[PDB]
Amino acid sequence: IVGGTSASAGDFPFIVSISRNGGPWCGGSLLNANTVLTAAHCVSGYAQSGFQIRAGSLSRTSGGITSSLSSVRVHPSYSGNNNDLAILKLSTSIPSGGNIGYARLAASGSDPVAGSSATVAGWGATSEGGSSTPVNLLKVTVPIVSRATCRAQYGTSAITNQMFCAGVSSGGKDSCQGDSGGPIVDSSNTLIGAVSWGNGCARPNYSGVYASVGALRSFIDTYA
């Protein structure tokens, strides 16, 4: 997260950190006791044994409850930037309670409205290109950017109806490498997306791009 602030205990109770080969990798959202939602690009094409999820901690390295993966399912139309969600099944179920909870999902057919406030969180780099990643969770609030504006930034075909955008025109506030797969919520605390891609991080005139939960809800419901 670039331009963010420290998360407090009990913020984002459904967030999980996802390590790969024992090192930081990405974020995700706990949907229920045995299921995590993340970005497809976090897991597609990689050995599933490399991953571990941690829930219920501000730290990505310690505390909370961990699990390995039993299975991975990417959206059936995932390709590159598009349809960038996956469902992970956990080897060890994770109960809600304390600083662990489950996400509430945007509805099928919904789309975030331009200018509405969203909050994204993760353990990714705090500088575009940063050399070390924080141990403790960060968060930042950014407005939704209309899909038409985002298409003017990236190209018409580059932003699909399964993506939405968020950021500040002058830059400075964004998700970044290592934040992929983690949650972006709306002003009702409903999970509206997962961190997906962008041109650098927090650059003026290049919004962060998020995989849309509303657009991909049928896949999520099928496998959750």
One domain for residues 37 and 124 = no
Set 29, 84, 179, 212: catalytic member: 84
One domain for residues 107 and 177 = yes
Alpha helices (H) in 37-196, listed in sequence order: 40-43, 147-154
Residue 84 annotated in active site: yes
Set 29, 41, 75, 186: catalytic member: 41
One domain for residues 98 and 135 = no
DSSP letters of 132-153?
S--SB-EEEEEEEE-HHHHHHH
Task: State whether residue 17 is helix, strand or coil.
Answer: strand
One domain for residues 205 and 118 = yes
What CA–CA distance (Å, rounded) separates 54 from 16? 5
One domain for residues 173 and 154 = yes
One domain for residues 20 and 90 = yes
> Domain count of the chain?
2
Dihedral, 134, 136, 137, 139 alpha carbons, nearest 10: -70
The CATH number that applies at residue 156 is 2.40.10.10
One domain for residues 5 and 111 = yes
Set 67, 180, 196, 207: catalytic member: 180
Judge residue 188's burial from the number of C-beta atoms within 10 Å of its C-beta, 0-12 exposed, 13-18 middle, 19 or more buried: exposed
Residue 6 annotated in active site: no
Which domain, by its residues, includes 179? 1-12+103-214
Residue 41 annotated in active site: yes
Task: Kindly provide the resolution of this structure in angstroms, with one decimal.
Answer: 0.8
One domain for residues 156 and 94 = no
